[PDB]
């Protein structure tokens, strides 16, 4: 193994192991949001040593950047003892990344092309609401990310919301065709940075959360966590789907709203109109409801283009860049 360090903290990395996984398995945090080379948030400066850049794509890590000594922690494997620089906060404690002993407790068809998967764990998992877990497709080897809908106290049964992708390896080929209660599932977690700041740094200000499709999943955990901390706070949760057939858990959100007068749940249908529901695209509905985003925080999760367009729309209505949070469901193939 090689010694790899960030922020004064050392871990030992096996030669076939990536920098990111070595650090998180040691409880040493650095930014990460996909573990597959697409989000670019794990970019590092190599200060000393040497890495193999692995499968790092050019659009995430250019030849120019490699020549200047940058790398992606989730793609880089050490070829010598290596010292790296991440962000200022890298090196702080985080929940350790670990291998899970996970068993399917339930798989339920909950909406058009949508399944809930409940995974029971042998041991409690420490995580922040909004983090995700990485599943391995049995027999295939493909790795795919699924956000937790859980609050952190729901630490023994992981809740996933899975959207069927036609022709998809993990969804069409397994989670929608074959997965059954009692199956063991290869999984590691937690991963990801899409979560609330520590309670001490949470001013209780208003939040808008926008989920495209099953991008709703981490927002369920984040919204419930935020409301537990500040029960009267304003939390606007928009669910952007094609039609009413895509909606789910309406009763659960209604119970949240009855308890929390600042909470609202707003379906937004883009393709199949329904008189009961707002039409259009979900970021558009928030802008209509809240014409000025100044002083708001915003949480966007879903397909990458939806997130990126939503971020820009938030900023044009003067929401502060510092308070905009993103989780992109970027395809792995
Ligand atoms: C951090 C992160 C968190 C995620 N959390 C969730 C979650 O909570 N719930 C969830 O359902 N998914 C989530 N995803 C997306 C998920 O990991 C898979 O990519 C998705 O389920 C499709 O995988 P697949 O193997 O079925 O399709 P693949 O076999 O990888 O793709 C099949 C084909 O369809 C294309 N494709 C892939 N995705 C889409 C898509 N949405 N729409 C249209 N075409 C597509 C692919 O490019 C490919 O050509 C997350 C992704 C990331 C990076
Ligand atoms: S590019 Fe490395 S975690 Fe996303
Ligand atoms: Br476990
Ligand atoms: Na990193």
Residue numbers in the entry: 2 to 334
Reproduce the article's own wording on this structure.
As reported in a companion study, we isolated a cytochrome P450-reductase gene pair, gcoAB, from Amycolatopsis sp. ATCC 39116 (encoding proteins with accession numbers WP_020419855.1 and WP_020419854.1). Unlike other known tetrahydrofolate- or non-heme iron-dependent demethylases, which are fairly substrate specific, the P450-reductase pair characterized here (GcoAB) demethylates diverse aromatic substrates, potentially providing an important advantage in both natural and biotechnological contexts. GcoA and GcoB operate as a multi-domain complex; guaiacol is processed exclusively in GcoA, with electrons supplied by the GcoB redox machinery. While the organization of P450 systems is diverse, the architecture of this 2-protein system, combining a catalytic P450 with a 2Fe-2S ferredoxin domain in addition to FAD and NAD binding sites, represents a new class.
